[PDB]
């Protein structure tokens, strides 16, 4: 360790504030992608929240999503646990009602202690551009895209997002 996890996360906290404090796209490659990323309560760096914006040319365009990030006491040896809010998005790889996410770089086999929260939140964003509807957490949204029905895919997602603002 709870020692080296804490120093790692405090390094990251500085890098994060410095990165996201800029509107210059070389220091900040995450402009318009990650709107904010901070720990929910500063006495507890084990819990964080993030806001991303939907990637362009997807039905997530022009909407924001809040993401919860749990850092286990064994970070960065194990990945964080990342999820959406419940009933906040509809995606092949998200179990909507729980917000659970299936993201490959978070799996034992694939995780590198080199990746950080920024890389994990970016990868979640990347997932809204590039779904993997072949092993889906949401099997009905999976079945749409696996049938190529792009009109239904864009319609249902836009329906869902518009109706969420209401």
């Amino acid at each position: 360790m709870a020692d080296t996890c804490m120093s790692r996360i405090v390094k990251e906290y500085k890098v994060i504030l410095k990165t996201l404090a800029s509107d210059d796209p070389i220091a900040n490659p995450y402009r318009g992608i990650i709107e904010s990323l901070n720990p929910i309560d500063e006495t507890d760096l084990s819990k964080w929240e993030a806001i991303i914006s939907g990637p362009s040319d997807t039905p997530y365009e022009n909407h924001q999503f809040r993401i919860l990030i749990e850092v286990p006491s064994s970070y960065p040896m194990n990945p964080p646990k990342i999820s959406f809010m419940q009933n906040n998005i509809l995606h092949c790889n998200v179990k909507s009602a729980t917000g659970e996410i299936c993201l490959n770089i978070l799996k034992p086999e694939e995780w590198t202690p080199v990746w950080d929260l920024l890389h994990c939140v970016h990868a979640v964003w990347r997932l809204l551009r590039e779904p993997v509807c072949d092993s889906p957490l949401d099997v009905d949204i999976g079945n749409i895209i696996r049938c190529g029905d792009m009109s239904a895919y864009q319609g249902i997602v836009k329906y869902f997002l518009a109706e969420r603002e209401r």
Binding site: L90, D149, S151, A152, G155, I156
Partner: protein, 117 residues
């Protein structure tokens, strides 16, 4: 008082009903248009009435039946209204697990009655 949430499958015969859509556009309705079985795009007046109150997002165009019935499943609205005669089993055996009340009618009084409550 309380109308029930609705999933409405907009085949030709349903598009043809004399319904003042401005009146239901605000409600929790979803319109699933089967482009597979419609000869093209949905009638202008219908699109115009949802558009007028910014409920245009409640119209969803579906390039396939499988895709359409996946939408019905996921949205889970109380009622599901369709006329399976514009498609000739049509309704997947599955549908009653996600939906409370299916109306599959051929009769104008019945369809109008459940849409207008």
């Amino acid at each position: 008082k309380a109308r029930k949430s609705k999933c409405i499958i907009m085949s030709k015969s349903i598009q043809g009903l004399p319904i003042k859509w401005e009146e239901y556009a605000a409600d929790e309705v979803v319109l699933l248009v089967p482009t597979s079985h419609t000869d093209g795009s949905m009638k202008q007046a219908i699109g115009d009435a949802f558009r007028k109150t910014k409920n245009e997002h409640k119209i969803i165009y579906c390039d396939s039946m499988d895709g359409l019935w996946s939408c019905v499943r996921r949205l889970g609205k109380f009622q599901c209204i369709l006329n399976s005669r514009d498609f000739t089993a049509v309704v997947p055996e599955d549908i009653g697990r996600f939906v409370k009340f299916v109306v599959d009618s051929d009769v104008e009084d019945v369809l109008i009655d459940t849409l207008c409550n």
